[PDB]
RNA sequence: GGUGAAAUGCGUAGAUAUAGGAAGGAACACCAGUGGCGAAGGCGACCACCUGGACUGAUACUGACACUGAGGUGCGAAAGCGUGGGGAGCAAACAGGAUUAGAUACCCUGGUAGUCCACGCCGUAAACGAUGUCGACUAGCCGUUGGGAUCCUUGAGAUCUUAGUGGCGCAGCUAACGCGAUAAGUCGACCGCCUGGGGAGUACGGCCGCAAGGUUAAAACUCAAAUGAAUUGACGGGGGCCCGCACAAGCGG
């Protein structure tokens, strides 16, 4: 939640994995989509 | 880690023909002999109702009718403190502590007779009025904190 | 008294659970907290308390009629969802449960991330 | 066209049942109007035109 | 009945608390995006006013007016520092309460400086892309932001073109990792800098500062090394799979 304060330095680390889970997710499947 | 165990228990005699008492002798010989044990083994089961009016089973068959828990409590964790599960289970299960739990809680009256020792309490499933059906409403007691311990954390 | 319906809400903390029966004006009429069922120290911040504490809050609520609730939630520890359950069962017909919980829009700074 | 804080049946589209702004990766929206989006909103809303929490 | 577990504020003063009101600061959820703008530091509500630079399209004009830059001079997160407002929330110091051989801490309950505003100072950061600025060139493919133009055109769109922002990758380079039109390639112009590890970004001097201190900046002496990147192993209070009476069924000191 908005339970403790996050330091804007450890909040300036985003994108888990979107342009991976989201962009290779059309390239690591296309083993056998061809 | 599959199970390769197989149940199969032999339920016939040449005396009782009974059901869950027939293949018994096991704890009733002793590691001894069976010679001396022979007039132990199958000499209650001709005591227990040589003091009442109805046959022996007819107080040996109510013995799963008080003296089986309805729940379990077998321990497991997840990341805080251990929970067990407790829920209806099978037969088998619940009603196995419904005889062995009555048989062997009789060397703490030991009356004349080792064979009137082992049909002590064999009488007593019926009423429950003893010690077999003391411990088998204690079990759902406990069991208030346990109440949601099955599917959340469990 | 008697009032028929009333506004019934849900404190739900991560350390206690706190269940208060008003009418819609508000008042407070019977309440009820899973430490106040005799819990103190450790143990249950969990839906099996609140499940505790939400039925008293329903069978003292149960001298001024009160048929019909409608739920508010406040709050996000466990017994949140096991207290409204916990509350059709002592012969509630709730019409639908409302979630309340505060929400800054920036606010003021939260507290230091425990380590 | 270029959409409005008046015009609500527009603006009633992006908004979600708790009021929110729906983001670009729900609506299939270009990054200029959706942020032309949010100031209408955010125009309608101050003006009274549309809550800002579900509540009222 | 917080949690690796309990201890402070409450009832002849009403206890977390109402469907209520008022005050006051401070931060602007959603939008929010390998998104955007800015020389960097930075900048997130909305509206108005004052203002800077970019991008972009054609056309007209000036005609090398350019590039870089020792000195210098501006602007520079935070925290600190005067001087005066302010003071919700949070909170160095500090008080207790725990936890532990101790605990001077990590956890709890508080809480003044500070954080906020005005003017002035400091002038530093892992101030980082650990990568100076400018210019020209060198395979492609996949996103995205601001434009523009072409495309049968409905755009649900497509293509090329620019200026940004990303993900792969050919050549090439690299000690390797890796970089690869946002070069660490290929070259050019200029500047800053480095010369084994400690001593040490330290003494002494000078300059600056109100201070804290900054900046410029060594030697004696000491050691044969420090160091980078990758490799095999061992190890981890790293992670994921797997096994065995390892975990509890009807044993017994």
Redesign the interface.
């Known amino acids: 939640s908005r339970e403790f304060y996050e330091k804007p330095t450890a909040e300036r680390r985003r994108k888990a994995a979107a342009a991976v889970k989201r962009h290779a997710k059309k390239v690591q499947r296309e083993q056998r989509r061809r | 880690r599959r199970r390769v165990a197989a149940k199969r228990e032999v339920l016939a005699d040449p005396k009782y023909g009974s059901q869950i008492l027939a293949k018994f002798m096991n704890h009733v010989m002793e590691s001894g002999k069976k010679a001396v044990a022979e007039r132990i083994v199958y000499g209650a089961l001709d005591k227990v109702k040589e003091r009442g009016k109805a046959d022996p089973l007819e107080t040996f068959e109510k013995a799963l009718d008080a003296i089986a828990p309805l729940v379990e409590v077998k321990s497991r964790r997840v990341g805080g403190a251990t929970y067990q599960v407790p829920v209806e289970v099978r037969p088998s299960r619940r009603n196995a502590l419904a005889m062995r739990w009555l048989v062997d809680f009789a060397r703490k009256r030991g009356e004349k007779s080792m064979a009137l020792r082992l049909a002590g309490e064999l009488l007593d499933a019926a009423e429950g009025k003893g010690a077999a059906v003391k411990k088998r409403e204690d079990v759902h007691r406990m069991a208030e ?1 346990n ?2 311990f099955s599917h ?1 954390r469990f | 008294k008697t009032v028929v319906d009333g506004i019934a809400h849900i404190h739900a903390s991560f350390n206690n659970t706190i269940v208060t029966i008003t009418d819609r004006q508000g008042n407070a009429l019977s309440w009820a907290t899973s430490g106040g069922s005799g819990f103190r120290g450790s143990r249950k911040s969990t839906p099996f308390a609140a499940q505790v504490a939400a039925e008293r809050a329903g069978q003292a609520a149960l001298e001024y009629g009160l048929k019909n609730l409608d739920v508010n939630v406040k709050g996000p520890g466990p017994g949140r969802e096991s207290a409204v359950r916990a509350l059709n069962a002592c012969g509630y017909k709730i019409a639908s449960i409302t979630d309340v919980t505060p929400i800054p829009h920036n606010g003021c700074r939260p507290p230091k991330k425990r380590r | 066209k270029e959409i409005d804080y008046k015009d609500l049946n527009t603006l009633k589209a992006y908004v979600s049942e708790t009021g929110k702004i729906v983001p670009s990766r729900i609506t299939g929206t270009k990054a200029k109007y959706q942020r032309q989006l949010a100031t209408a909103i955010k125009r309608a809303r101050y003006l009274a035109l549309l809550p800002y929490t579900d509540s009222h």
């Open positions: 904190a109440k949601a959340y």
